[PDB]
Amino acid sequence: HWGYGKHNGPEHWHKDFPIAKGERQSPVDIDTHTAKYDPSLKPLSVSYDQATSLRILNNGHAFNVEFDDSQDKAVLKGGPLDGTYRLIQFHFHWGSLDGQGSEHTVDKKKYAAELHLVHWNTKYGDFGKAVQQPDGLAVLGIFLKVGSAKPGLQKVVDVLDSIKTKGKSADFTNFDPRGLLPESLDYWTYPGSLTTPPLLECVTWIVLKEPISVSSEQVLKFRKLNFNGEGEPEELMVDNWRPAQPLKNRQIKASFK
Ligand SMILES: Oc1ccc(O)cc1
Ligand SMILES: [Zn+2]
């Protein structure tokens, strides 16, 4: 199936998913000088106090921390968003080397990794019907740079040994995603897509300007995971990022002056 190698990576995905060459694909380069402050944006509200994590899973493309989204518990609202979006999962994209790994770039700068907190619009009832809508999803994207350890990441790093290969999962209750957020919620926003197949164009992206710092040791542990399943030849899970796609007829709006 699709992946990130020479033979099945991003430059191939359009064959099975022609929306790969669509009009509002993600990620994009954020040209900070061209992004315009939008005084029409309402304050962003990240409300993660009642978040209920359940499980961590290696899906062969990344690992996902999954949440109970059967009720309004961890939600995103405000900023560009109309109504309430429920957190369903987070995951990361990262590099084989510290100089690459993010999907969005900032004035062509690649960070070492990028976190995506995926939310769906509760007007649509569940995630599967939300991905049939042009405003079905909101993804909060957060850059990681290598520097000081992030203490609120270490519970994720420590469980990775238990989900090394594709299809492995573990319990992952009581994890507080507030520990992954930077101090500032200044952001850029634009309409885009899932960055993995099926590449659906449902996503309001909200990309925070402030990166979080993680340690070299933390990111090295991400790079020990495997794309393959248990008892298949080992292929390190690295460079699981899609490069920037054409901006087309879109404008990137800033939340800050
Ligand atoms: O459900 C989603 C998964 C990945 C994305 O990049 C966006 C939404
Ligand atoms: Zn992602």
Swiss-Prot record:
Changing T195 to D/E: Strongly reduced activity, but enhanced zinc affinity. CDD domains: alpha_CA_I_II_III_XIII. It is an enzyme of class 4 (lyase). Changing V139 to F/Y: Strongly impaired activity. Zinc. Can also use cobalt(II) with lower efficiency, but not copper(II), nickel(II) and manganese(II). The record marks Q89 as: Involved in the binding of some activators, including histamine and L-histidine. Changing Y4F: Enhanced activity. It catalyses: hydrogencarbonate + H(+) = CO2 + H2O; urea = cyanamide + H2O. InterPro entries: CA_dom (IPR001148), CA_dom_sf (IPR036398), Carbonic_anhydrase_a-class (IPR023561), Carbonic_anhydrase_a-class_CS (IPR018338). Its EC number is 4.2.1.1, 4.2.1.69. The active site is at H61. Residues 1-256 form the Alpha-carbonic anhydrase domain. Changing W2A: Impaired activity, not rescued by 4-methylimidazole (4-MI). Changing K15E: In Jogjakarta. Optimum pH is 6-8. Changing N59H: Reduced proton transfer. Changing L194F: Normal activity. Zn(2+) binds at H91, H93, H116. Catalyzes the reversible hydration of carbon dioxide. Can also hydrate cyanamide to urea. Stimulates the chloride-bicarbonate exchange activity of SLC26A6. Essential for bone resorption and osteoclast differentiation. Involved in the regulation of fluid secretion into the anterior chamber of the eye. Contributes to intracellular pH regulation in the duodenal upper villous epithelium during proton-coupled peptide absorption. Target of drugs used in treatments against glaucoma disorder and breast cancer. This is Carbonic anhydrase 2. It comes from Homo sapiens (Human). The gene is CA2.
